[PDB]
Amino acid sequence: SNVLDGLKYAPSHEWVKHEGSVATIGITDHAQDHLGEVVFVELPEPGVSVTKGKGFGAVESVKATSDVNSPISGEVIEVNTGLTGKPGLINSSPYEDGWMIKIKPTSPDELESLLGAKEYTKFCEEEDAAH
Length: 131
Ligand SMILES: *C(=O)CCCC[C@@H](S)CCS
Known about the structure:
Elements: E1 8-9, E2 14-19, E3 22-27, H1 29-35, E4 38-42, E5 49-50, E6 55-61, E7 65-69, E8 74-79, H2 82-85, H3 89-92, E9 101-105, H4 117-129
Bound molecules: dihydrolipoic acid.
């Protein structure tokens, strides 16, 4: 699918965007392309703490329920409430308007463990090739 360079990725197909002292999380284009039409998004509550590797919400498609794992840890400060109304933004704008949450990174260096665009692309290739 389509990959962007200014982001750090997770094997479970989530992306992060570091900007000063905040991280914007969402799911990649490869993810939505594989999920199919997204029909519902269940996001966490503000103030709640997310943990690296643990699920914070879920995305439902016409076929299934896909739990989204937080790529890093932090406190949720913001949530895209527009997704409840327009779940489709995930399919149409995964990297921009399809943003799910905004967190205060509690352990910033966790971003080092995160893959880059090229690293992720190779990854997506390997996973697609295992079929
Ligand atoms: C169909 O909905 C099955 C789940 C697809 C999820 C994506 S992230 C699979 C990537 S190989």
